[PDB]
Symmetry: C2
Subunit: 170 residues, 2 copies
């Protein structure tokens, strides 16, 4: 595990950089697919995977990956920070500055992170005891990220999207 202060900071910066490169490449892969460049999309998805490999390498070099219950706990703490501190403040500041699009994107994320924190707390209770959670499918709204387990609601309560738009993970 890396211990020296400057190298640790540089790897955390590189982790952030690789995560953001991965994410832009996923966003760009979807746009290329929509514009009629399916091979360009394939290249973006593939390079996105390479940047996952690089960020995973940095993250393990920093000592941050543990067993499932501990990884769930990191999930819980991050989701809790975004629900209680980060997104309420960023949403209030956007409203204060009149930036309606940011009001919306921060509202969307906040309502979903409330769900994520609760799901990871239910998961951790099972993983603590060596059990897997019993969920069969998870549905995700592709507009706002709203997350539902086992059945999709009739429409998304956060953005109003129809049940038919939800993405299924089975």
């Amino acid at each position: 595990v890396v211990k020296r202060t400057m190298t640790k900071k540089f790897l955390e910066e590189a982790f952030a950089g690789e995560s953001m490169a991965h994410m832009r490449y996923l966003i760009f892969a979807e746009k290329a697919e929509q514009e009629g460049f399916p091979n360009i999309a394939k290249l973006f998805r593939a390079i996105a995977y390479a940047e996952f490999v690089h960020a995973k390498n940095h993250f393990i070099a920093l000592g941050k990956l543990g067993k499932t219950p501990e990884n769930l706990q990191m999930g819980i703490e991050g989701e809790t920070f975004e629900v209680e501190e980060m997104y309420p403040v960023y949403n209030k500041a956007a409203e204060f500055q009149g930036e309606k699009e940011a009001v919306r994107t921060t509202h969307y994320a906040l309502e979903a992170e409330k769900i994520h924190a609760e799901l990871y707390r239910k998961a951790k209770e099972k993983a603590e005891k060596g059990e897997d959670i019993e969920i069969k499918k998870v549905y995700i709204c592709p507009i706002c990220g709203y997350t539902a387990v086992d059945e999709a609601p009739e429409y998304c309560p956060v953005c109003g999207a129809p049940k038919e738009k939800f993405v299924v993970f089975e």
Copy 2:
């Protein structure tokens, strides 16, 4: 597009936070699968997709998504930044501080970003004239992110992993 300075900054910070949560969750999904919790793995994967949605929303609200040629150009500049500036410095610093694990993860990423920059330059040439690239598959090394289009060397030139371990995008 968001224009006020503080809101823009908070959206950039939220984009970084959602990217890193997505990346953590993909890393955690793989560890859950290895430890024998496939339903917790499925949960991490679906919630990572929700964070893709939230990041993509902030990224569009900042006005950073364009057409494929402009997105490739953002690719080129980021990859060129990592090759000529960021990784050489972080790698030399890790070496100076004796942090061999960081020397290795920065070396792995650096050699692959060299290839990414060149692939995106080749892709943009075609995109900016309305044509798709012609590629069949892309191979990615799961140890260091080495990337090869159409034909792969029999062993990864950076870490030595055999071609059978490469992840194939087709």
